[PDB]
């Protein structure tokens, strides 16, 4: 098996029954486990029959459930322009009638059927003369201009942050007395002593690393999700998820959704005012950094519409087991180990890890190795046969060549890690898009 | 009483006095408490007189004090416009005199008494001809335009984030030997062994959940406060708290406070240039999400100008008690329980919790129940009589109907929870406001 | 020495060798240390020879390594303008040729050698008449306008956040049996039992405070660094680090770097269109809040291109030591203490702490003092001689005068702390800068 570190102590508990009291001696064992998909073994025994069956714990990690906050709905959108200009003393082009135009004024002046769709209106005044537009008097030309936004795809996008991530620890827990194997599954919570078959498990300690990726906009296209650069309700931060503000789901499907100016910077030409803006299709921002999103210490995955995020190595659960009328003793599994390296793969200085594949053999039950590169420090759990490991280190250069020294409970094993890593680009787009439909 | 989980161990400490040494045996007890406004009982005893008095601990939760960072002062503001236009060869409307106008140039051209108030100037050039404004020569008309900002209410608004929240644990701690009751109050800190009367308390462990709402703009209108979507010093992020940048308190009262363009998008008309902007009155953003602000795991409340934020259920303090020359033993309080449900209330997918009210009886000293709905998992502390509980679950749909199964140390108790939850809208306002005072 | 709080327990471990089993009794000791640059002593002994040598632990704190995410490159930049206007029926000033100008169109119309540098183009149309520009026909004057950006200094700026900060604990660990001193240095990790000479150290607990400054833009000018108000890839948030978006290092040196409009708000004059923008030189934002950046609970320092950040007081490591075939016992060091105060210094309500200097004497081996002001609570480790302490309290007013009561294991010591603190201003600049080079 593996090698954990433990403490054995005495627990004395007095139960209060109806007008009655019954005290109980016990033995209890606090074991400190780095979850790491280990195989943590234990041995039970009473004073009388020293063999009583082996116990096995396999923590699937330390996970955090999300507590959503649906903040911000949006849709694949395409912002378009429109304009219409008149001569003097015609339509609304007189003293102050075009000058008192309202922002949301749906004009009955060649505004197409899409007038209802959200947007903004504006009144400009260009030169008016017999060589400026072609009228007969030299009176300024009023220019009605209308921006709005169409959708593109019949879907909706739910943006949400996630405060108050809640702790949980699920463990595959098996027991082998003489012949059989129960291998139940348990859901431990930070103070709530669960009881699978006959033993009480409690989550006494958590040493999670401070990981501030847990506060960031998870976007959802129904079944699909991703992480994104934050955007906040009411600010219309351009060129990020949600330069369109749709508050309600029904407000999205019916498409009553506000956006802001400062996106499309219009410049006048007196015939076809040119408005250039960003062609925001959020699906891109999603594709920039989607889920699941593994990394060195954490990984953030959805499972039936709930964004769990767990950690493997940087943390160390601290568990407390009580065998009813027994006592527990761990098992230290001494064994050397051999290491088969590989070539690095992926990006350097990225939220993802510089990938690897370190096969390793144990000539014995699976044991743990505290791998130590130049700076970083990871762990692996290599066993008798094969058992590759993808471990996602975090170097920050292009060329990498270092002497990473694994260390199993036997003798350390030096080796070498080489590779050439490429830098990714998050993304970029400046204002180079425009589209107008004049009528 | 309740049921906590404990460890009893031996502590041997040798005190160094002046050229002297005195060692001491002891008994010590580490108990793991989910604060939850419990009533955690304990029983003291020496080898000689096994009754020595009961001890009672009632943790008020795990709280975080704030360490302010006053970043950003602002005021209820209303941005206004003004303009004045001239004919040719008059005032400053000649070769390049209007073209070299400075940004902060307080012009002596019909700029009212409010000229001193912050803002911006601009020089436009509209058509000039005998039908454009009414002058006699066909030379462009220079247009002086001035934006500025007035206050509305004689108050000030302090924006501040809060890094380095500090840990604290206050506990109501009572003792009952034979006749009386001391019920002191203690302030435990993460490593500093306090000593109330004759026993040493130390905060050995904290399992707080990762809660990234603790980094967000707390706004303060003196006695009142609230949480808000972040805004940063120097960016003038429109339509959020502080499109006005006031650095100093005295700089606010005297009102020397900068704001930026990109708020009011002006469009020319040669007589009354129309500038539309947001009517930012921060009191609104405050009313969007004020304090106190309870939720499922945490609540954030101010108490005498200090923003504490504590947690109840998601966490589990780990305490370490030492009775001087005694030993401690907990008490397990077996008792079944009955549950009286209620109807859900509030919002779904919101930082607030889907409210409930679960009365429950214990037929014995107050005990703990590990309530388990479909996904969520809360705890309650129901007792002999009445004792409602508001618990703020976190469902994420409109209709909700599930089989939540409470679980007391006796037998579990199935029941059903139904409700219809409504979605709230954070807020939204596009540029639909404008106000001008031409003279 | 100091006074720590401990637990002594029994550990029984059975090692599995090749087809062999060997069990081992032991003694183990879990000590709870607030790192605080203490001198935590310990005493070893077996049943036979009760003197076996003193042990000394000196934790350098609880530190967090950064796992970079290079997001955003930029450079000291200066944005400039340019323009050129023509008469009618000349160049590209006809029906719709200036009106179909592209955004990134490098025009062969007096666009200087710097045309290649990034920017934006625009076509305006001012009055055209015999008194508007001086042509002979009264046809509008097309105005070609070009914004771009030059660099200033031949350096590059790396912006990066830092998710998944990893835990580490380095400790100076010495031992003194009879004559000599080994004073090794150890690197403890959250679950990985290190072994310096003959004893196993493990990091069983961490009570770090929730500190949300650990998610903020660290900017780097090569050897220099600082903390800054966040900016995100693709949003071009004006007046903060990176209104220029340079994705790649090579893309910066060659200077192919995008920026956005909404910075320089141009206003037409038909000869010299005036464009005013912010003169962003990031070195300023760096100087606003540079590293190292000490505070009350944490400090964030770089050491060979790696941003460590450690904490001193608000936290309490929980360590677990095992002496091979011995047992450990702490030492309590009773001693009164004298305190020499000082005058406060620095800012109030700032991420930095209100500075102090509290000399203090111990008349014995260095001991610990739980200093308690009106609200705050710090700790110091004063010793026989001198030993100043800079402790960085966090008051939030200008005038401060309170009765801070130190408390050593002997009798408390009242004193008084006075001072006058000044408020700092983060920074501010509105649009008051412009520069044009017409040709
Ligand atoms: C492994 O590499 C380390 C470098 O840190 C070196 O100190 C050690 O001697 C090496 N072990 C070998 C070569 O067996
Ligand atoms: C309570 O509901 C659970 C569903 O999770 C079910 O398994 C159990 O049998 C129920 N108990 C009853 C009906 O007594
Ligand atoms: C020290 O000040 C405290 C105020 O909190 C007071 O209660 C105590 O009596 C003082 N001790 C003295 C004056 O010795």
Numbering used by the authors:
A (entry chain B), B (entry chain A), C (entry chain C): 1 to 439
Quote the passages of the study that discuss this structure, keeping the authors' original sentences.
A recombinant ectodomain fragment of Atlas GC (polyprotein residues 2330 to 2772) was expressed in Drosophila melanogaster D.mel-2 cells as a secreted protein. (B) Cryo-EM image reconstruction of a soluble ectodomain fragment of Atlas GC at 3.76 Å overall resolution. The structure reveals a three-domain class II membrane fusion protein fold. The structure of the Atlas GC ectodomain fragment is similar to phlebovirus and bandavirus GC structures, specifically the trimeric postfusion GC structures from RVFV, Dabie bandavirus [DABV, formerly SFTS (severe fever with thrombocytopenia syndrome) phlebovirus] and Heartland virus (HRTV). Domain I, a 10-stranded β barrel augmented by a three-stranded sheet, organizes the structure. Two insertions in domain I form the elongated, mostly β-stranded domain II. Domain III has the seven-stranded β-sandwich topology of fibronectin type III (FN3) domains also found in macroglobulin domains, but the hydrophobic core and disulfide bonding pattern of domain III differ from these and other annotated domains from nonviral species. The most notable differences between Atlas virus and phlebovirus GC structures are differences in the disulfide bonding pattern and in the composition of side chains lining the glycerophospholipid (GPL) headgroup binding pocket conserved in arboviral class II fusion proteins. With 30 cysteine residues forming 15 disulfide bonds, Atlas GC contains twice the average abundance of cysteines, more than has been found in any other class II protein. Specifically, the fusion loop is constrained by four disulfide bonds conserved in phleboviruses and bandaviruses, a fifth disulfide specific to Atlas GC (Cys129 to Cys138), a phenylalanine (Phe136) required in phleboviruses and bandaviruses at the apex of the fusion loop for membrane binding and fusion, and two conserved glycines (Gly128 and Gly134) that provide the torsional flexibility necessary for the fusion loop’s tightly folded conformation.
We identify Atlas virus—an intact retrovirus-like EVE in the human hookworm Ancylostoma ceylanicum, with an envelope protein genetically related to GN-GC glycoproteins from the family Phenuiviridae. GC proteins are class II membrane fusion proteins, with a three-domain β strand architecture also found in alphaviruses, flaviviruses, and Rubella virus but structurally unrelated to class I fusion proteins. Atlas GC has the hallmarks of an active class II membrane fusion protein: a stable trimeric assembly, a putative fusion loop, membrane insertion triggered by low pH with specificity for late endosomal lipid composition, and membrane fusion activity.
